[PDB]
C-alpha cells in the first residue's frame, strides 16, 4: 500500500472515523484529475486508495473532509477541509502515511515517508 | 484589520520570515480569484491584507509557500505549500488571525477568530 | 520581557483566557522552586513574569493548568496539565515565548526565542 | 496492551526510532515513583511498557525524552523532555496510546484512549 491516511479526533480523544478522503494528481495541462477517494475506517485509517503501478511520480493533493465530519457531529467547524499538497516519488517508488490531528478549529498533518 | 496571517518555523524556533503568502476568494463558477497577498515580516505576520468594506462573506483559500520558504533554507521539505480554506461569517467575531507552525515534513494551523 | 506565554483554545478559535500558569527553576538539590506565576489575559497572554536580572541560565519548567480550564468551560479534559521543560541560554536570543494550542485530549507547543 | 507510545520525527518524515520513555505514577504520598521505561522501535513505537494487572487507575507521566533523541542527531534542541501527565483508569481499565509529533522547538501530543 503506496498511500496510506490516518486521522484523529482530539476533541474525542479517538479515531476519526468516517472521514471521507479525496486524492487528485495534477495533468500536464496543470488542472487537479480525481486520482482516487475513500472514507477512514472504525481504526481512522484509509487503505486500498490507489496501487504502486498506478502510483506514479507527480503532485498530488490529499483532501480531508474536516467539514463534512464535523457537520456529521453537529459541530460547526472552521476549515472547509484539510488539504495536503506534496510531489511523491520523484526519487522512485516510496510509501507515504498521511496524519491529521483534527480540532474544530486548527489541524495538525504530517507525512511519514519510507522506502520499501 | 480583518484578515492576518503568522507563520513560525518549528526547526529554528523563530518567526518564519519573508514567507510568500497568496489569498483567493471562491468566484461563483467555483474557481479562485486572487484576493491579497504579501510575504511576512521579521516578526513572521502579515498584516494589511484586506479591509473591512472588501472582505465579504465567502469562502477563501490562504496559500502559504512553504516549499520556497524551506528551499530558501538550504532544506529538504515535503509539502509544495500549505493551503488553509474557510468561510467568512458575519456571525461569528470580527477578526481572523490564521497561524501556522511548519516543520518539513508537519504543518500546523489555528484559526484565531475574536472581537475588539 | 525575557519570558511570555500564550495560550490558544483550538475548540473554540480563540485565546485561552484565565488559564493559569505556573513557572519554577530547578534547583541544585533537582527539585523545582517556584519562580512565578499567573492567568493568561483575555488576549491568551501572560506577560510580567520575570525581568532580565532574575531569569538567568538554568532550566525552567512552565506549567499550564490544562485541566482547570476545561473544567471550567465544562468539558472533560485527558491531561492533568501541560509541562513545558527547557534550558534558558545566554547564547541564545534573549526573548522566550512559550506558546501552547490546547485541546481536550491534544495539545502543542512551541518555542520563539528572539532578539530585538 | 494498555499502555503504548508512538513518536514521530516532523524534520525526517519518519519515526522517532530509539527515543527513551520513562513512565511514573503519583504515590499515596505525591511523589512520582518509577513505573515503567522503554525505548521506542524502527517503528517509532514502544510497546510492553506494562501489564492490565499492574496499570491500575492513578496519576500517571509518561516522559519524552526528546532531548536526548534530537542531541543522538547532532540537533540541540529546545525542551528538555515532552512529559505527558494523565488519570488513568478512572472509570475502568482502557487502553491508552500516547502520541507525539517532534520538531527541535516544538511538539505536538494526542492521546488515543479505548475501551476494550
Ligand atoms: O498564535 C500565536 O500568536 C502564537 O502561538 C501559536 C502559533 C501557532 Cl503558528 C500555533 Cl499553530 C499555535 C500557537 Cl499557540
Ligand atoms: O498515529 C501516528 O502515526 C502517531 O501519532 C500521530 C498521529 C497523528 Cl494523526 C498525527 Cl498528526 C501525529 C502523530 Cl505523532
Redesign the interface.
Known amino acids: 500500500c503506496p498511500l496510506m491516511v490516518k486521522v ?8 476519526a472515523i468516517n472521514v471521507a478522503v479525496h486524492v487528485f494528481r495534477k495533468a500536464a495541462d496543470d488542472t487537479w484529475e480525481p486520482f482516487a477517494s475513500g472514507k477512514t475506517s472504525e481504526s481512522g485509517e484509509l487503505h486500498g486508495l490507489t496501487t504502486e503501478e498506478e502510483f506514479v511520480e507527480g ?1 498530488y493533493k490529499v483532501e480531508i473532509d474536516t467539514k463534512s465530519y464535523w457537520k456529521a457531529l453537529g459541530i460547526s467547524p ?4 484539510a ?5 511523491a516519488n520523484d526519487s522512485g517508488p516510496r510509501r507515504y502515511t498521511i ?1 491529521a ?1 483534527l ?12 522506502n520499501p
Open positions: 484523529l479526533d482530539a476533541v474525542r480523544g479517538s479515531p503532485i472552521f476549515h472547509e477541509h488539504e495536503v499538497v506534496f510531489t496524519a490531528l480540532s474544530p478549529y486548527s489541524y495538525s498533518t504530517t507525512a511519514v515517508v519510507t
